[PDB]
Ligand binder design. Structure first.
Ligand SMILES: CS(=O)(=O)c1cccc2c(-c3nc(N[C@H]4CCCNC4)ncc3C(F)(F)F)c[nH]c12
Length: 278
């Protein structure tokens, strides 16, 4: 069939959706990442739309193959991801110029996506792919144990209708993690995740987040924790970085900085594109 054209090299992982292989296209010679999804006409169209969402900081969707109760997604292959790179840089830390470069590129990717009203919905270090050229790319565009660490509070509080702000939240959480070498909000249940957020950022109220007390899963019985200083949260990040990060972690989605506006932030005045040691 269609899949005879792909020579499996190795299983590279497995997710909620399905299994990912490193594979070789026998006709093009291309090395690819191949996702097998076990099985809808709406997914076929919504995924096919991702084939046109092409940007240098988005992993390239080469092919959508719907054959025989199975959907295969053929993607560009990259050798490393940010979770593994973070782990390999634990003793030393990712140098700030590279953190900055990565954050900048990811915001370009988001800006592009968000300009087309496409949300990612599920940014996490594992799905941010890096190469030897200094590039970082968004992968695994979510459609609409699964990690909760990068989930925006409006999602946790039961907002049915996400805005692009959910991605900015997630990227802020990733930025802080690259800086501190520890996850910002490592929740192990939805309530633990929400309360970890509250313990750092203050339990939100109508002052800081108009509408919060009407949200579907908002409970008046939530404990009232006070906000901590950001200088406590992400030392030794500089004032530009902390200012940007605070704007990316605003509780209210409508106050949260956009990707486009983040790209103009003074934090990026001295941005460069270093090459990492992989
Ligand atoms: C989170 S999961 O279960 O969905 C999953 C499992 C395994 C690989 C992937 C990838 C992926 N991985 C690579 N490379 C791997 C190489 C090994 C070090 N991590 C990166 N290259 C391209 C992709 C592509 F986005 F195109 F699908 C995306 N999601 C994955």
């Amino acid at each position: 069939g269609a899949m005879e054209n792909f020579q499996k090299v190795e299983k590279i992982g497995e997710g909620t959706y399905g299994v990912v292989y490193k594979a070789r296209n026998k006709l093009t010679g291309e090395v690819v990442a191949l996702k097998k999804i076990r099985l809808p006409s709406t997914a076929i169209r919504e995924i096919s739309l991702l084939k046109e969402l092409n940007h240098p900081n988005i992993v390239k969707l080469l092919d959508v193959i719907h054959t025989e109760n199975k959907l295969y997604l053929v993607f560009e292959f990259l050798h490393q991801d940010l979770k593994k790179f973070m782990d390999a840089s634990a003793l030393t830390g990712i140098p700030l110029p590279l953190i900055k470069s990565y954050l900048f590129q990811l915001l370009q990717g988001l800006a592009f996506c968000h300009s087309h009203r496409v949300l990612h919905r599920d940014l996490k270090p594992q799905n941010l792919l890096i190469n030897t050229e200094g590039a970082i790319k968004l992968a695994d565009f979510g459609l609409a144990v699964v990690t909760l660490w990068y989930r925006a509070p409006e999602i946790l509080l039961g907002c049915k209708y996400y805005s692009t702000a959910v991605d900015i939240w997630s990227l802020g959480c990733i930025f802080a993690e690259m800086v501190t070498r520890r996850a910002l909000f490592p929740g192990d249940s939805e309530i633990d995740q929400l309360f970890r957020i509250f313990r750092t950022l203050g339990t939100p109220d109508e002052v800081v987040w108009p509408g919060v007390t009407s949200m579907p899963d908002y409970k008046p019985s939530f404990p009232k924790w006070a906000r901590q200083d950001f200088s406590k949260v992400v030392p030794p990040l500089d004032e530009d970085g902390r200012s940007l990060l605070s704007q990316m972690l605003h509780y209210d989605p409508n106050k949260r900085i956009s990707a486009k506006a983040a790209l103009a932030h003074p934090f990026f005045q001295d941005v460069t594109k270093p090459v990492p040691h992989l």
